[PDB]
Every structure is written in C-alpha cells, then in structure tokens.
Amino acid sequence: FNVAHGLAWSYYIGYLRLILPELQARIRTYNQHYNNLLRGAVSQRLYILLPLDCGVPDNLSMADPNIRFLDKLPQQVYSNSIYELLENGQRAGTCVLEYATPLQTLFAMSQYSQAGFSREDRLEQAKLFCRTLEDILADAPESQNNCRLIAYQEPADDSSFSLSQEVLRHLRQEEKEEVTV
Amino acid sequence: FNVAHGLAWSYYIGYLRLILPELQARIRTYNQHYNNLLRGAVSQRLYILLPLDCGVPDNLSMADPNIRFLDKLPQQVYSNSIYELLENGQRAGTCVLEYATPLQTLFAMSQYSQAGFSREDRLEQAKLFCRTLEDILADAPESQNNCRLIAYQEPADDSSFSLSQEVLRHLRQEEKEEVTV
Ligand SMILES: CCn1nc(C)cc1C(=O)Nc1nc2cc(C(N)=O)cc(OC)c2n1CCC[C@H]1COc2cc(C(N)=O)cc3nc(NC(=O)c4cc(C)nn4CC)n1c23
Ligand SMILES: [Ca+2]
Ligand SMILES: [Ca+2]
C-alpha cells in the first residue's frame, strides 16, 4: 500500500503532461521582453520543489526571502510564477518555480489520524514519490527535458540551509550543461 | 504497485474532505427555493459516478439523455451541478451529480504506452479505487453520510443499461432509508 505511486502518476497524467508542452513556448516569448528590458533570461525548464518534509507554504518567499516573485508567466488556463533568486540582494537567477502539490496530500494524511499514516510513513512516501516521478519523466517524451526535480531534506534544525542556494545550484548546473554539450 | 491507493486518498484528502462539509448547507439553502418554485427537492448527498470503464464524458447528458442539467449549486470556489433524472419525459428525481475525475487518469494511463498499463489493469485499478474510497469514507466523520458512491459496469455491449435508472434506484433507496429509520 503505497500512495506515492498513484500520487505521482496522477501528478504527471493530469497536470505535467498537459502543462509542460506549452511551457517552452511561453518562456521563449517572455524572454524576448525580459531580455530587452532587464538583460535577463528565464530558464526554459519548470523547476519543481520536492521538500521531503512535505511542507508547502502558500507563498515561496516565506520559505526563503531570497526567492522573490518576479512576474506571472503569460499563456500561449494555467497560472505560473517566475521568481528571481537573490544573492546579497543581487539577482542571481530567474526561473518558473513551484511546489509539487501532491506532497500537501501526504502532509494532510499524516495529520489525519484515521489514516494511520505516520511521519515516518510520510517521509518514506515522499521519497518514493520523488523516485516514481523521476522514473516516469525518464520514459516521457520531451517532458523530462522541460522540467527539473529539486528534492531536498531540510536539516533537523539550526543549520545553514538556503532554498534559494539549492535552486541556484541547479540553475548553474543547467547552464553548464547547456554550454558544454 | 497500485495507483488506485494514491488516487483514492488524493481524491479524498484534496477534494472530498474539503467540499462535502459545505454541501449539506448549500443544498438545504437551494431546496428552499426549489421547493417553493417547483415543489421539488434535491437529495442532500453528493452522488459520485464511478463507471468501471473509466469513461468520463464532458457533459452528463451525452452518457444518458434522461439526465438533464437543472441548475448550478450556489456557494455558501467549487462548481457543482444539479441534475434532474427523467422517466418518460417526466421529472423523477434531482441530485448533485458528478463523475470521479481520478478515473480519467486511469483511462489516460491505459492510452499511454510507456505506462505498460492495460485495459485489464485499468479495470482492476478502477475496482480497487472504488473499494479504497469506500473504506476511506467508512472511517470518515459525517463525510460518508454526505455522499454516495455509484459504481457500475456497463454491458459487454448492446444491452439495457440506463445510467439515469441506476441513479434513480439509489435515490429511491436513500429516501426509503430516511423515512423508515
Ligand atoms: C487533489 C484532489 N484530486 N486528486 C485526484 C487524484 C483528483 C483530484 C481532483 O479532482 N482535484 C480537483 N477537483 C476540483 C473540483 C473543482 C470544482 N468542482 O469546482 C475545482 C477544483 O480546482 C481547485 C478541483 N480540483 C483541483 C485540481 C488541480 C490540478 C488542475 O489545475 C491546476 C492548475 C495549476 C496552475 N499553476 O495553474 C496547478 C495545479 N496543480 C494541480 N494538482 C494536480 O494536478 C494533481 C495532483 C494529483 C495527486 N493529481 N493531480 C491531477 C488532478 N492542479 C493544478
Ligand atoms: Ca520546510
Ligand atoms: Ca461508459
């Protein structure tokens, strides 16, 4: 009995498979403007946050102030937000960013006692969700190329973890890949 | 590996658990009007269609013409549709009616070859979805009393199946239950 299998399949079949095709077009279009205006550029892949603690806030900035809402992405109806990632108040990157909503479900199950679903269970299913979704996107056509999964475990407490730094690590790796190959 | 577990849990935690509480109230309010106008009454329970063939149309009437849209249910934002069930052109019942969307996912998985998910698999998982959702609602607090699951397998082919008759059987059984106990 693994809820993560179905959660992952539903998240792909009912959301990602449908939104990802439009995305590279929406982003190229926006980048025309963003470039001519702020000489910037938004990455072309959807960045999906997978906090293994299943903590999904209502606004990204609350999880890190160095992640700042920049703009809504226009459509070619799905709502997507571009964020700028800051370092010392200086813009270091930009990307379309959002949390994997199914993890909220996991969280809620852990707070729903009739479910008999512990925090241990919840973490286990979060990792399985990440794995299953990786596997799905691996066999998927151009969907894998259109997004990147950012899975992370935050420290038990009082340790220097920056979500913005994790995302920037991924963005910089993506650019390195793009220019070297 | 059973996607129905997660599909069922997500459909409960993320949709039903949230909408059902408002529903008894929304329906009572509407019934004030409906009564004073057409001397009719809408059942208080959400009726959830679970076709085991995972065929979900975009409008109920296409699956049966004796199921006729009547009105949108107002809010106390979620969109819910009241339907009248007809017999020989005469109204025989009314209720808030909608398909279980997760079945669409199953259908799509069966048409997505990378999934290795057959029609046999689709039917098995549809039955498991029905069972798991029944189990969940059974342990759930007054949520089970707010909705009713209408699961059905349509004929091999060319036999007498009427969706409106199935729904009316359930509605008539529900009224019998309310008046006798
Ligand atoms: C969670 C409940 N659930 N579990 C399963 C299984 C099926 C359902 C289900 O039926 N949900 C649902 N019923 C609604 C009814 C009404 C109404 N009658 O008024 C109104 C709704 O909108 C609130 C309803 N919603 C929300 C569906 C959101 C669904 C599409 O839109 C989205 C838009 C954007 C966006 N940036 O623009 C992001 C984004 N992220 C997700 N998440 C999933 O896609 C996902 C997760 C899992 C697991 N599977 N999926 C596929 C269903 N989405 C969306
Ligand atoms: Ca956290
Ligand atoms: Ca059918």
CA-angle at B74, arms to B102 and B80, nearest 5° = 15
Pocket of ligand 1 (CB under 6 A): A 7, 10-11, 14-15, 78-80, 101-102; B 7, 10-11, 14-15, 78-80, 101-102
Count the residues in chain A.
181
Contact A40, A34 (CB under 8 A): yes
> In 3D, which of B144, B170, B152 has the Cα closest to residue B12?
B144
Contact B3, B109 (CB under 8 A): yes
Which pairing describes strands B46-51 and B147-152: parallel, antiparallel, or unpaired?
A: parallel
- Please state, in angstroms and rounded to a whole number, the distance separating the CA atoms of residues A44 and A28: 7
Query: Measured between alpha carbons, how far is residue B121 from residues A5, A53, A67, A121, B132 in Å?
Result: 14, 32, 43, 26, 16
Q: Which amino acid is at A143?
A: S
Which pairing describes strands B46-51 and B67-72: parallel, antiparallel, or unpaired?
A: unpaired
Burial of A95 (0-12, 13-18, 19+ CB in 10 A): buried
Contact A151, A50 (CB under 8 A): yes
Contact B168, B85 (CB under 8 A): yes
Domain boundaries, chain A: 1-42, 43-181
- Please state, in angstroms and rounded to a whole number, the distance separating the CA atoms of residues B105 and B85: 27
State phi, psi for B145 to the nearest 5 degrees.
Answer: -75, -15
Q: What is the CA radius of gyration of chain B?
A: 17
Question: Cα B159 vs. chain centroid, distance in angstroms?
Answer: 22
Burial of B114 (0-12, 13-18, 19+ CB in 10 A): exposed
- For A112-173, list the strands marked E by DSSP: 147-152
Contact B147, B45 (CB under 8 A): yes
Burial of B123 (0-12, 13-18, 19+ CB in 10 A): middle
Q: H/E element holding A178? A: helix A163-180
Q: List, in order, residues 6 or more apart from B44 with CB less than 8 Å away.
A: B23, B24, B27, B28, B146
Q: Where are the alpha helices (DSSP H) in B73-118?
A: 102-110
3-state secondary structure A15-32: HHHHHHHHHHHHHHHHHH
The Å distance, Cα A15 to ligand 3 centre, comes to 24
Resolution limit, Å: 2.7
- Please state, in angstroms and rounded to a whole number, the distance separating the CA atoms of residues A6 and B9: 9
- DSSP lists the bridge partners of residue B67 as B85
Contact A174, A148 (CB under 8 A): yes
Q: H/E element holding A158? A: none
- Please state, in angstroms and rounded to a whole number, the distance separating the CA atoms of residues B134 and B144: 8
- Please state, in angstroms and rounded to a whole number, the distance separating the CA atoms of residues A168 and A151: 13
- Please state, in angstroms and rounded to a whole number, the distance separating the CA atoms of residues B29 and B40: 13
* DSSP letter string, B146-163: GEEEEEE---SSSS---H
- Please state, in angstroms and rounded to a whole number, the distance separating the CA atoms of residues A31 and A26: 9
- For chain A, list the strands marked E by DSSP: 46-51, 67-72, 81-87, 90-99, 147-152
- Please state, in angstroms and rounded to a whole number, the distance separating the CA atoms of residues A153 and A52: 5
- Count of beta carbons in the 10 Å neighbourhood of residue B69: 13
Annotated binding site of A for 2',3'-cUAMP: 15, 101
Scored b (16 or more CB within 10 A) or e, A148-174 reads bbbbeeeeeeeeeeebbebbbebbeeb
State phi, psi for B40 to the nearest 5 degrees.
Answer: -105, 175
A interface residues, B as partner, C-beta within 8 Å: 1-10, 13-14, 102, 104-105, 108-109, 112, 114-115, 139-140
